[PDB]
Amino acid sequence: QVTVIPREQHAISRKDISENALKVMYRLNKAGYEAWLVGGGVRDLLLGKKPKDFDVTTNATPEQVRKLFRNCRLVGRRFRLAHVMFGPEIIEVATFRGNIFGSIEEDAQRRDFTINSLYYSVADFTVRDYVGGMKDLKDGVIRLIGNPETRYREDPVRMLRAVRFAAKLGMRISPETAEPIPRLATLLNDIPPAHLFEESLKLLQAGYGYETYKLLCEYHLFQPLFPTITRYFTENGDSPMERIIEQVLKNTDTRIHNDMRVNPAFLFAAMFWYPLLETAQKIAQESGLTYHDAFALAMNDVLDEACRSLAIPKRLTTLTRDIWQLQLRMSRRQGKRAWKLLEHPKFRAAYDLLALRAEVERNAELQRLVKWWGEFQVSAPPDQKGML
Amino acid sequence: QVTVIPREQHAISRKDISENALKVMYRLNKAGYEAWLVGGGVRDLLLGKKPKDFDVTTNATPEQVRKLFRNCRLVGRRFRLAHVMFGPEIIEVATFRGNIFGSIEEDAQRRDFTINSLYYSVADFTVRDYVGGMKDLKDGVIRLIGNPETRYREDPVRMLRAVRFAAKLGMRISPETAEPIPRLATLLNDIPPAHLFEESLKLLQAGYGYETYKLLCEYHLFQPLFPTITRYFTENGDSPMERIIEQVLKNTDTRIHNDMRVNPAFLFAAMFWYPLLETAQKIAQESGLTYHDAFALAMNDVLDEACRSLAIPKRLTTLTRDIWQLQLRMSRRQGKRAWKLLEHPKFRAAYDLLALRAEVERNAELQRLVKWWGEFQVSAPPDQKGML
Ligand SMILES: [Mg+2]
Numbered sequence: 001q002v003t004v005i006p007r008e009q010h011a012i013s014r015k016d017i018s019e020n021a022l023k024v025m026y027r028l029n030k031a032g033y034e035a036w037l038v039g040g041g042v043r044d045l046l047l048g049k050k051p052k053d054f055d056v057t058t059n060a061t062p063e064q065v066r067k068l069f070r071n072c073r074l075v076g077r078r079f080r081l082a083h084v085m086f087g088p089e090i091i092e093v094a095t096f097r098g099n100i101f102g103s104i105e106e107d108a109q110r111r112d113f114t115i116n117s118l119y120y121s122v123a124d125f126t127v128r129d130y131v132g133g134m135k136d137l138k139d140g141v142i143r144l145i146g147n148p149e150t151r152y153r154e155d156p157v158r159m160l161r162a163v164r165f166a167a168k169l170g171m172r173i174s175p176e177t178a179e180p181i182p183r184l185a186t187l188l189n190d191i192p193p194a195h196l197f198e199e200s201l202k203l204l205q206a207g208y209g210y211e212t213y214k215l216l217c218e219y220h221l222f223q224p225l226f227p228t229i230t231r232y233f234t235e236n237g238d239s240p241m242e243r244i245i246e247q248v249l250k251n252t253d254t255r256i257h258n259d260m261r262v263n264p265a266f267l268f269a270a271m272f273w274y275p276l277l278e279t280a281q282k283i284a285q286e287s288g289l290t291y292h293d294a295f296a297l298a299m300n301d302v303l304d305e306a307c308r309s310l311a312i313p314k315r316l317t318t319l320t321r322d323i324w325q326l327q328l329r330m331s332r333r334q335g336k337r338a339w340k341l342l343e344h345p346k347f348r349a350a351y352d353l354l355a356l357r358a359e360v361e362r363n364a365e366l367q368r369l370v371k372w373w374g375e376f377q378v379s380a381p382p383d384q385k386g387m388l
Numbered sequence: 389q390v391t392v393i394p395r396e397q398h399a400i401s402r403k404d405i406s407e408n409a410l411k412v413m414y415r416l417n418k419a420g421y422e423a424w425l426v427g428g429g430v431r432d433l434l435l436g437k438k439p440k441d442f443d444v445t446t447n448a449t450p451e452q453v454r455k456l457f458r459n460c461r462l463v464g465r466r467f468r469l470a471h472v473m474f475g476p477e478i479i480e481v482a483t484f485r486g487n488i489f490g491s492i493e494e495d496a497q498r499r500d501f502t503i504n505s506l507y508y509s510v511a512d513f514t515v516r517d518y519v520g521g522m523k524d525l526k527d528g529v530i531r532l533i534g535n536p537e538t539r540y541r542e543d544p545v546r547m548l549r550a551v552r553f554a555a556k557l558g559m560r561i562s563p564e565t566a567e568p569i570p571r572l573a574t575l576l577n578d579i580p581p582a583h584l585f586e587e588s589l590k591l592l593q594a595g596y597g598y599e600t601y602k603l604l605c606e607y608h609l610f611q612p613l614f615p616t617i618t619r620y621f622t623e624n625g626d627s628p629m630e631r632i633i634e635q636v637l638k639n640t641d642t643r644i645h646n647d648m649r650v651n652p653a654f655l656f657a658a659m660f661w662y663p664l665l666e667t668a669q670k671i672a673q674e675s676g677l678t679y680h681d682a683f684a685l686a687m688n689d690v691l692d693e694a695c696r697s698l699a700i701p702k703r704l705t706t707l708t709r710d711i712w713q714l715q716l717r718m719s720r721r722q723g724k725r726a727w728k729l730l731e732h733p734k735f736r737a738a739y740d741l742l743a744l745r746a747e748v749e750r751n752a753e754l755q756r757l758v759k760w761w762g763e764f765q766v767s768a769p770p771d772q773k774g775m776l
């Protein structure tokens with residue numbers, strides 16, 4: 001058991017890679033308080049990689065953190081936890097917890113996993129490890145902190161997080177941490193769908209999506225979130241839907257690493273596609289009506305019951321409705337309206353779906369439509385005219 | 389002589405082809421004033437096409453108009469002319485003019501051209517013609533009202549208008565109205581660059597551009613507006629600049645006849661391109677700087693001289709510079725920095741310009757970066773990955 005690591009034993013964590021929340025700590029340190037660097041950032045630093053956040057903690061009460069910074073720009077609210085602003089770097093300043101506000105050792109125990117629970121002191125260049133930490137981090141192990149059994153019951157979402165970190169760093173989940181998930185997964189249904197929607201994005205949409213879906217599938221965590229989707233999985237292994245989902249995820253992933261921006265309205269529009277299509281089949285051959293009005297129904301429903309687990313915001317659903325709408329429109333080869341279409345704000349997305357639709361089905365009459373719209377959109381107006 | 393023409397014998401501008409700004413004439417009629425439809429609208433109606441506006445004129449004081457329409461959504465300001473709103477519809481309601489104002493006939497005289505000064509009443513279905521009006525309409529003639537010489541001096545923009553209508557409608561400028569133009573052309577230099585900008589757009593961007601240019605050139609009206617460009621014309625008639633200024637105008641025109649949003653800042657960035665290219669190279673030898681630094685100066689230069697005639701908005705000058713800059717970036721066979729580029733807001737315009745640049749110079753080198761970028765921009769991240 002090693003509770004304090006000296007800077008000369010702990011990987012660089014060189015004071016010079018800490019941007020300047022340094023100013024935020026030195027200020028506290030000057031005032032008879034303690035300033036520690038917790039969680040995400042301090043993990044990464046030890047890891048070698050570049051911190052994306054810098055969060056700090058202190059034995060200073062939240063009203064004591066208030067006075068010391070009444071002159072600075074403090075962004076809003078939140079019990080405990082204060083928000084400091086430079087600009088394109090905001091710094092989180094949280095008071096230790098335990099009756100309510102306690103010690104560093106106390107605070108370490110209410111933190112979900114090991115590595116995300118290392119602490120750094122500018123004041124002593126030491127990192128504090130009241131937990132597995134340093135070893136877990138070295139061995140590459142996502143270990144939970146209290147008794148898995150009970151923690152997952154208090155906050156089930158911890159279970160999702162477990163996988164998420166599992167995929168983003170190349171690490172494995174501790175056996176005792178792993179055992180309970182498949183049994184307890186269903187517990188995510190007692191979760192406010194909104195909260196789930198956030199974690200759906202943190203999982204797929206943060207550029208690890210593919211590896212995180214593999215892990216979400218291997219622990220039956222995928223199913224409580226996307227029941228409309230699980231249902232159309234197949235024994236064989238790789239139907240058209242099961243291919244698209246992999247692909248859109250690998251791509252959504254590639255875009256993030258090349259630093260593109262990305263549409264979440266898209267990722268859903270892709271994944272629920274084939275289900276929408278299936279529901280269009282049954283809706284038409286049964287209860288016989290036109291394919292158009294049928295399809296329209298399939299949307300409301302697919303989206304209704306999906307929106308029953310994740311709470312997709314009215315905004316995204318409505319763009320999705322459009323990316324699907326375009327799928328039909330683009331299908332019928334025709335003229336004049338084409339300009340009207342190319343103009344559509346969600347066109348770029350709609351094209352990228354048709355892209356997938358044709359890659360996965362390997363249906364060459366789509367890949368046909370795909371070359372046509374490919375050329376119609378990079379082509380200049382005299383030739384655009386000639387294509388109709 | 390032939391001053392009042394009845395519903396049957398006029399190309400029945402049928403009461404049914406008036407947008408319910410009929411509701412606004414009615415309140416005026418019902419209330420004891422008369423109310424007539426003028427110009428823009430009544431001209432297109434008699435011609436058959438769908439009007440783009442409906443302006444009504446009345447003999448109510450601007451003060452009496454203000455009172456009668458209190459219950460209404462009347463958008464403010466501007467002596468005389470009064471404005472009324474509905475949905476996507478605004479209805480211009482101006483008093484007649486003449487101490488200041490008086491009889492319908494007194495008004496017809498301060499209007500610039502014949503055809504735009506026909507009057508229609510829904511109260512009688514008669515159109516009043518107190519000028520060549522009807523006959524000129526039939527004959528296909530833009531004819532100034534009073535004494536050309538005097539009027540063009542009173543307002544030089546009447547000159548541009550004349551050439552604009554000439555081009556948009558398909559008709560000839562009457563002799564007595566054409567003679568003074570080439571002489572008085574310069575007169576435009578005495579006018580705020582603001583106005584010249586406004587009108588510069590009604591001429592080239594309204595989707596008649598090309599024809600309106602063939603005219604602006606044939607009347608030495610082009611030069612006062614684009615000193616910088618005129619200077620670069622060539623007797624041959626086939627320099628790459630001249631080709632481009634034609635093409636871009638044609639293309640802009642096509643865009644407008646297929647209801648596309650058109651970019652103002654593109655147009656300019658296309659015309660001045662070659663003057664920018666030229667002023668650049670001259671700065672390159674005349675004063676041995678790197679080409680990259682040279683260029684940015686040349687941008688500054690080309691822009692102030694043009695700003696010296698047209699009051700181009702700081703808004704649109706930023707966009708233009710950006711479109712041009714991208715022209716260097718896209719030339720370097722850039723690697724992974726490309727993703728960032730693909731993302732630029734302006735990239736579509738930059739691309740559309742590299743587009744032309746290849747088409748007019750009939751260069752193969754460039755024609756390649758066009759085929760390349762054409763693909764990289766529609767490909768999927770797998771494919772796209774590869775290309776780099
Ligand atoms: Mg944070």
Ligand SMILES: [Mg+2]
Binds near residue numbers: 441443480
């Ligand atoms: Mg008007």
